[PDB]
Design a binder for this molecule. Sequence first.
Ligand SMILES: C[C@@H](c1cccc2c(-c3ccc(NS(C)(=O)=O)c(C#N)c3)c(C(=O)O)[nH]c12)N1C[C@]2(C[C@@H](CN)C2)OC1=O
Ligand SMILES: [Zn+2]
Ligand SMILES: [Zn+2]
Length: 232
Amino acid sequence: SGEYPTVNEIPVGEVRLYQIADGVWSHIATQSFDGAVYPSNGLIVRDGDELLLIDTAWGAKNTAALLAEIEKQIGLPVTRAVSTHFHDDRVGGVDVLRAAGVATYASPSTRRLAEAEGNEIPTHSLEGLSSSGDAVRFGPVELFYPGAAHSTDNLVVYVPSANVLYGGCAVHELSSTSAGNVADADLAEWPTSVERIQKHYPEAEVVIPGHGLPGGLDLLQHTANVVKAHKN
Ligand SMILES: C[C@@H](c1cccc2c(-c3ccc(NS(C)(=O)=O)c(C#N)c3)c(C(=O)O)[nH]c12)N1C[C@]2(C[C@@H](CN)C2)OC1=O
Ligand SMILES: [Zn+2]
Ligand SMILES: [Zn+2]
């Protein structure tokens, strides 16, 4: 009924959308992994009479449900998708997208990691993102590579029309006490990568984490704090 939707409010398999700003929504779904249930976010950005999708809904059936939810709520076609790192909460569902006629994109780093680990593989390579601090335009967003953090390949996405910063899994929600799933992380580089984000996007108004509630710029500092403390 209007609040940001949370893990116990979304059965696995169902997707909800949340309006962030004019022409910007997040998508929220839930999935089981290793016997626990987790929420996760992605982004939808209006691109004229089409939509750009950022990240899958964490699984094939969730991603089909995402497409159906977008058709219900928005009614414009998803034409392109970008995955912001190689994990299943970002690429699981790319096969569904690709069979729905969505052109799927990720960095070469993400593509290599996905292939090596047996995750679904976006079709198209995003060049120009291989050095920390790199940025490229993609439709109505800017893609930015901050350096290694949650994963070595993680990208962030900025919506300049709305000052929306989608941090993906390099950014944690304010209620987080722990640094999430750190299996593939670089805890030592993570704070430096967050500081690059802070420097590059000082006018962000909304910050969206990869999992959990959006907020403001404080999510960035909070993330740096929790990662440093976890590493400690
Ligand atoms: C698919 C993905 C994955 C799965 C399960 C949970 C998470 C989480 C995560 C964990 C705790 C959280 N909150 S909590 C402490 O319970 O309160 C929250 C929240 N909100 C989010 C994240 C994240 O932090 O981004 N990602 C996850 N994978 C899997 C894996 C690849 C590797 C195996 N080779 C392990 O690494 C990874 O990230
Ligand atoms: Zn991840
Ligand atoms: Zn994640």
